[PDB]
Amino acid sequence: KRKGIILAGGSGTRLHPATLAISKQLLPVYDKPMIYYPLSTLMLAGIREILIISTPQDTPRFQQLLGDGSNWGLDLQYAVQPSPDGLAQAFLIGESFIGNDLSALVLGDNLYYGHDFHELLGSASQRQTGASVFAYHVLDPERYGVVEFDQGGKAISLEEKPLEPKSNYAVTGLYFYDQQVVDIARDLKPSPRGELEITDVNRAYLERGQLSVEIMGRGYAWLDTGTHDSLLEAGQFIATLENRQGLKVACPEEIAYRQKWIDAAQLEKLAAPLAKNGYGQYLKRLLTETVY
Amino acid sequence: MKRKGIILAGGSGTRLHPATLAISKQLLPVYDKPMIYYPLSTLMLAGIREILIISTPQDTPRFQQLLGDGSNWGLDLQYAVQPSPDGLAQAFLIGESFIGNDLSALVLGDNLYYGHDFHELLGSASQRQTGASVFAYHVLDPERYGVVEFDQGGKAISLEEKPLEPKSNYAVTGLYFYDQQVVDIARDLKPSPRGELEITDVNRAYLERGQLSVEIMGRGYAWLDTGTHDSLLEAGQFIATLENRQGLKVACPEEIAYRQKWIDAAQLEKLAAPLAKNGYGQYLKRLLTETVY
Amino acid sequence: KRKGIILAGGSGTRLHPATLAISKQLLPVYDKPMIYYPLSTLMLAGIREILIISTPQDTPRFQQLLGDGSNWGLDLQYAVQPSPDGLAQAFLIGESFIGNDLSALVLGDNLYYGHDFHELLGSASQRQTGASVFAYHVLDPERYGVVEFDQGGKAISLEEKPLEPKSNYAVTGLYFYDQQVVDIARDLKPSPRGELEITDVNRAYLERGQLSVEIMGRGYAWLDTGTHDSLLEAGQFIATLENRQGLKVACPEEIAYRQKWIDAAQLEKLAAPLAKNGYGQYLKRLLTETVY
Amino acid sequence: KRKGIILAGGSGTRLHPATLAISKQLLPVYDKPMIYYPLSTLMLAGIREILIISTPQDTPRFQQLLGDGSNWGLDLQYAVQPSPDGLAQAFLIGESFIGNDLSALVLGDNLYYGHDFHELLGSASQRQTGASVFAYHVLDPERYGVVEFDQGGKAISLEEKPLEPKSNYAVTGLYFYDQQVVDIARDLKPSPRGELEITDVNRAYLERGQLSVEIMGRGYAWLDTGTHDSLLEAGQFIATLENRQGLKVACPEEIAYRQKWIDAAQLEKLAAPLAKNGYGQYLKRLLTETVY
Numbered sequence A, C, D: 001k002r003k004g005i006i007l008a009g010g011s012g013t014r015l016h017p018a019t020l021a022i023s024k025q026l027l028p029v030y031d032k033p034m035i036y037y038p039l040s041t042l043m044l045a046g047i048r049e050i051l052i053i054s055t056p057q058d059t060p061r062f063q064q065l066l067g068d069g070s071n072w073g074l075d076l077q078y079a080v081q082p083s084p085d086g087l088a089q090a091f092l093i094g095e096s097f098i099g100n101d102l103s104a105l106v107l108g109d110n111l112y113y114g115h116d117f118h119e120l121l122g123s124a125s126q127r128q129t130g131a132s133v134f135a136y137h138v139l140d141p142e143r144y145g146v147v148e149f150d151q152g153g154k155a156i157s158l159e160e161k162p163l164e165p166k167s168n169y170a171v172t173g174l175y176f177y178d179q180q181v182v183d184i185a186r187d188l189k190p191s192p193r194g195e196l197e198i199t200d201v202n203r204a205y206l207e208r209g210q211l212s213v214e215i216m217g218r219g220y221a222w223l224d225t226g227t228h229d230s231l232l233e234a235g236q237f238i239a240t241l242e243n244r245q246g247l248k249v250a251c252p253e254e255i256a257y258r259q260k261w262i263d264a265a266q267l268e269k270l271a272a273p274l275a276k277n278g279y280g281q282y283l284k285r286l287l288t289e290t291v292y
Numbered sequence B: 001m002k003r004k005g006i007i008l009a010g011g012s013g014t015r016l017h018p019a020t021l022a023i024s025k026q027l028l029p030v031y032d033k034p035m036i037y038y039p040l041s042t043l044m045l046a047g048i049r050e051i052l053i054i055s056t057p058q059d060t061p062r063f064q065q066l067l068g069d070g071s072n073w074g075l076d077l078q079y080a081v082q083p084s085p086d087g088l089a090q091a092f093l094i095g096e097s098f099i100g101n102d103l104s105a106l107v108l109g110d111n112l113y114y115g116h117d118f119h120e121l122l123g124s125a126s127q128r129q130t131g132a133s134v135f136a137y138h139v140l141d142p143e144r145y146g147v148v149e150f151d152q153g154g155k156a157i158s159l160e161e162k163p164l165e166p167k168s169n170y171a172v173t174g175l176y177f178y179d180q181q182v183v184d185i186a187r188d189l190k191p192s193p194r195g196e197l198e199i200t201d202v203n204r205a206y207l208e209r210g211q212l213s214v215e216i217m218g219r220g221y222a223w224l225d226t227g228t229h230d231s232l233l234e235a236g237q238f239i240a241t242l243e244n245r246q247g248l249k250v251a252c253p254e255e256i257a258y259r260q261k262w263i264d265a266a267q268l269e270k271l272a273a274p275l276a277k278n279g280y281g282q283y284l285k286r287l288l289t290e291t292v293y
């Protein structure tokens, strides 16, 4: 039984002033709020119980937007992070939420897409021990935690924001942990940057041969909307997919319905209030179209 | 005389839902800054410093959170609320006491204007002391808008709102200049079948006294309205292209307030500090020591 | 041992005047010529021997661009289509090129991209019987040959450009055939439209229970650059992936090298002439970076 | 009476391999061939007699595309540049074409757009002495000939590709000359770069107080399609204007018709062949819609 966390806080000083009125994760990527995407990633992982962490000031808004989850077959909860002191904090804040269960962490501005991504999630999720993460070839590795591989393609070390990256493989912002993560987090000390580092967590698992690093191929999309230009591109990527296919990406109603977490009657009900527009119309259509 | 401005930034996004489920359209970014900044900037360029921002009761706080009282940019921003999107013309009823006995000007919060000499264009409308001024712009789908009919000499003779059969492809954009007759005109309007108070009815009133001036806004200008997911995309992109080629930014209030001497160098510096770690802040700093024509 | 054909003729009247001076297929999608994309598709299918069909007028230009193929480990050949009389014509024009081998046909303006697309291709290409095609959910199936599924998801019929589509599954423009296709194409009669229809070819296989229709999931991208707008989006989809990953899509030098059809020396030499730009720089970098 | 030259040769080494088969200036920007853009610029300046300069290899195609000009009321001629030895070369190659007339030069991959651009053109074109150029604020002036201003805003010097730009005003690729340009070009010596430099021409005029530098404001768009990314953006810019307005940019048929260089009958005739598509339909529509 794995629980999930979405870490949707952070300042956004960068993308100011665009993000001065509202956290980034509530801004739309093309046609729907950013947080939907990562939300849909956990859903696809088979996770239904989820803790949304954010700034004190934007929780309400997150809640306004997502409610308790029941309408989509979910159980959402909320927690607050007063200061953006490190991904790993998510586990301290989320400790009692997690209890004795396996868990998963995903960044609220991280957008993933691709063929068999669902199976990919499935495999990580279904592991009952250790940790799983993902490595993705990128242009500037140095921004992220970077992984080093030996000659046989096995991961052998990690370095956070190295001056000189040993590879272009970055650790994406999706993480699956077993019951060691809380305690590992509790023993962490702030790095010179001043944060509690997920890399440090990942390393701890790696130092006991329990970290599993799956390469995420160039066929998948891992987009993070870290800059105005990237925010733009992402919105576009999705618009492109959406207008060709006639299907939508990261639409929670659909996933819930496909997973049988809600039934047709429920889906109809969710659609009424959105009937005057594309989105509602899409949901209706889903009730009478087999989509493979 | 002096002119006050209104930015009507309420309205549903019901269309745009669910994107707009968490915040109002007008607070979403067009590329690199909040939408409302654009029309805000339009009024500023019109020489208008005293401005009333109308929005849904629920989003006023967030508008306020973003723009403050205006004093930082040498402006005076007030705020008001529109419980229900009952027509552009309601603005004047809502902003009656804000307007008082001055000339005014209404702009739509999701309307984006850009082009060479747009400043002189504003200047002219703004400096007219009587009557009203609006703008006509060739578009693909005039039927979505209030449409203007012209005689053989290019003089506007009629207006129809959302006609089934448009008499021309010239739409009235969402930027309007009025003298002191607008409030009363607005106070005598009855809702159309759509159920709204129609700015077109307002415009027609002025036209029916030979006091509506309709300036053609040529194809050289951009009038974009971010009405759909796609158009929102295109706009952001339209802006991104100009900005990355020029090294200048569109609709950046700090810059306009400085250029118009509404704030001084010291004030501009101080506005920049908090944003230094990023492009936006860096830009402001750069403006202190570069002559930009 | 399967041979490939790229059909890259066709008029672009629709696309005039943009394509008045040069065939559609030689226009760039973002940073390399459109034909490279489908070219890459066949390469990834394991196909090295390929016939490029085009208008009489533009062949020389296609030749000028791709050469005989030796440089990328291919054997490219050329043929001409005076008139755009149907996809199926490719098999009459290509009859002797094909001889007694398995084959595949891909449209020159069809761009495919996704995770495990290579395995997808592998499976279809290694089949030693019947035909394989792909079905993809789109917004305007009426533009294409549409497939009909029964309640167990098995294909039961096809209709080219139907007034009322039985489903939103369009048959993409990628086709794998066994030795039956030539004789089948030889007995086709022109449809009312005046063309020899691949749908009729697809149907012939279907009528014997030898047509395999694989669903291509929403995780893959099937884009076809059939309108100004879409050509735009496509270019932009590619740029988005390329600028995030630091990898390039459909870059034949790379694919050849990855498949060991050319060696590092060959790759170095291919890059020299392009050294003063990104494309060349990319090639070089491939010689010293492991890319998974 | 001024004559115009469009310089559309050059190497695309940078944009390889995209441009290996055809010259960039024959690729489309969104919905029509690039060269249409500059072509329209000259037309808007009231210039009807034009020399198109290009590689030896692509002239034929340029000619195929644009004809002798008579269909659009122009008089087009052609010449060739075996090697891209500098913008000033256009004047040696174009000497006899120019004879004793005033002239103008525009780059073939330079796209201009804006309100009252036509009047801007008119003013420069009607000057009967000296030279006129335009200065425009850009992000990367070091890529261009840069201009330096005094405290009154008067141009005082030019540097081509300066390590350290004195300003961010670049000299765009649009130039108007009186009868001194040829002889000035005739006495140029190749810079270290190995080209005859238009900046050197512009300086010659500047040294006699006969160079007029007009600032082209941030309201105008000066885009050059010098990189994959910018070629994209440009396409996008245009599509965005076009689909909002229902008017098209740089559509020679229209400009000629507006300037009374062709009459309605001729316009109809030009549209017939393109009737099945947007472009044609647009031309038709122009016959019965007043457009201010």
Ligand SMILES: Cc1cn([C@H]2C[C@H](O)[C@@H](COP(=O)(O)OP(=O)(O)O[C@H]3O[C@@H](C)[C@H](O)[C@@H](O)[C@H]3O)O2)c(=O)[nH]c1=O
Pocket (backbone or CB within 6 Å): A007, A008, A009, A010, A011, A081, A083, A084, A085, A086, A087, A089, A107, A108, A109, A143, A144, A145, A146, A160, A161, A171, A172, A173, A195, A198, A199
């Ligand atoms: C530090 C922190 C960030 N965040 C949010 C804000 C941003 O949206 C986003 C990331 O902040 P950053 O400064 O980019 O985190 P970061 O600089 O730690 O970036 C991380 O990138 C990760 C993907 C890598 O896997 C890590 O190895 C690390 O490189 O997440 C929080 O919500 N809370 C926090 O305490």
Ligand SMILES: Cc1cn([C@H]2C[C@H](O)[C@@H](COP(=O)(O)OP(=O)(O)O[C@H]3O[C@@H](C)[C@H](O)[C@@H](O)[C@H]3O)O2)c(=O)[nH]c1=O
Pocket (backbone or CB within 6 Å): A215, A216, A217, A218, A219, A220, C040, C044, C112, C113, C114, C115, C116, C117, C118, C119, C248, C249, C250, C251, C254, C255, C258, C292
């Ligand atoms: C190798 C390669 C692929 N491609 C294209 C083909 C596909 O559209 C897309 C992804 O290619 P594929 O190889 O089908 O999938 P992939 O590269 O995303 O996935 C690979 O991930 C690797 C880590 C695993 O070891 C492989 O088993 C496979 O899963 O990229 C290129 O354009 N150029 C290339 O050089």
Ligand SMILES: Cc1cn([C@H]2C[C@H](O)[C@@H](COP(=O)(O)OP(=O)(O)O[C@H]3O[C@@H](C)[C@H](O)[C@@H](O)[C@H]3O)O2)c(=O)[nH]c1=O
Pocket (backbone or CB within 6 Å): B008, B009, B010, B011, B012, B025, B082, B084, B085, B086, B087, B088, B090, B108, B109, B110, B144, B145, B146, B147, B161, B162, B171, B172, B173, B174, B175, B196, B199, B200
């Ligand atoms: C009606 C209304 C809209 N708005 C916001 C909603 C959108 O953000 C934007 C426009 O709303 P619409 O329903 O499209 O307005 P509209 O349907 O009144 O369209 C207007 O279009 C103008 C450009 C024309 O000049 C007018 O003639 C008129 O046609 O206005 C409000 O804030 N309050 C309101 O009462």
Ligand SMILES: Cc1cn([C@H]2C[C@H](O)[C@@H](COP(=O)(O)OP(=O)(O)O[C@H]3O[C@@H](C)[C@H](O)[C@@H](O)[C@H]3O)O2)c(=O)[nH]c1=O
Pocket (backbone or CB within 6 Å): B041, B045, B113, B114, B115, B116, B117, B118, B119, B120, B249, B250, B251, B252, B255, B256, B259, B293, D215, D216, D217, D218, D219, D220
């Ligand atoms: C100054 C400024 C302008 N703008 C936008 C407003 C308009 O939409 C667009 C064009 O600016 P305008 O002042 O209308 O025109 P312009 O700045 O393109 O043209 C100017 O060219 C100058 C060199 C001449 O001296 C001036 O007379 C004027 O023509 O600029 C901003 O968004 N922010 C700003 O700070």
Ligand SMILES: Cc1cn([C@H]2C[C@H](O)[C@@H](COP(=O)(O)OP(=O)(O)O[C@H]3O[C@@H](C)[C@H](O)[C@@H](O)[C@H]3O)O2)c(=O)[nH]c1=O
Pocket (backbone or CB within 6 Å): B216, B217, B218, B219, B220, B221, D040, D044, D112, D113, D114, D115, D116, D117, D118, D119, D248, D249, D250, D251, D254, D255, D258, D292
């Ligand atoms: C006429 C025309 C212009 N253009 C380009 C030229 C410029 O880049 C831009 C705008 O054209 P211009 O005519 O320079 O500006 P404009 O058309 O935006 O402005 C005109 O507005 C009119 C209402 C006024 O009556 C005119 O005096 C002038 O102000 O459009 C075309 O691409 N095709 C065309 O057919």
Ligand SMILES: Cc1cn([C@H]2C[C@H](O)[C@@H](COP(=O)(O)OP(=O)(O)O[C@H]3O[C@@H](C)[C@H](O)[C@@H](O)[C@H]3O)O2)c(=O)[nH]c1=O
Pocket (backbone or CB within 6 Å): C007, C008, C009, C010, C011, C024, C081, C083, C084, C085, C086, C087, C089, C107, C108, C109, C143, C144, C145, C146, C160, C161, C171, C172, C173, C174, C195, C198, C199
């Ligand atoms: C007909 C034809 C097209 N072409 C090129 C031109 C276009 O770029 C592209 C397809 O042209 P169209 O006229 O759209 O062909 P088409 O209308 O037959 O389209 C096809 O789509 C495939 C994807 C489906 O599998 C088919 O069932 C079919 O619908 O083919 C040729 O090169 N030669 C030809 O004879």
Ligand SMILES: Cc1cn([C@H]2C[C@H](O)[C@@H](COP(=O)(O)OP(=O)(O)O[C@H]3O[C@@H](C)[C@H](O)[C@@H](O)[C@H]3O)O2)c(=O)[nH]c1=O
Pocket (backbone or CB within 6 Å): A040, A044, A112, A113, A114, A115, A116, A117, A118, A119, A248, A249, A250, A251, A254, A255, A258, A292, C215, C216, C217, C218, C219, C220
């Ligand atoms: C189902 C679904 C997926 N997605 C996302 C998940 C991925 O990013 C991408 C599609 O991912 P997947 O569903 O993992 O892969 P897929 O849908 O491309 O492929 C599927 O093709 C099917 C026919 C096969 O039977 C499955 O085995 C699988 O191959 O879309 C949504 O956003 N909404 C959805 O409702």
Ligand SMILES: Cc1cn([C@H]2C[C@H](O)[C@@H](COP(=O)(O)OP(=O)(O)O[C@H]3O[C@@H](C)[C@H](O)[C@@H](O)[C@H]3O)O2)c(=O)[nH]c1=O
Pocket (backbone or CB within 6 Å): D007, D008, D009, D010, D011, D081, D083, D084, D085, D086, D087, D089, D107, D108, D109, D143, D144, D145, D146, D160, D161, D171, D172, D173, D195, D198, D199
């Ligand atoms: C040099 C040259 C270029 N060209 C074409 C190729 C490109 O499409 C276009 C630009 O060439 P470049 O090598 O970028 O030119 P360039 O590097 O000479 O750039 C010029 O940029 C101008 C705009 C400035 O006004 C000049 O100051 C100068 O900087 O010129 C020719 O057709 N023939 C030639 O001899």
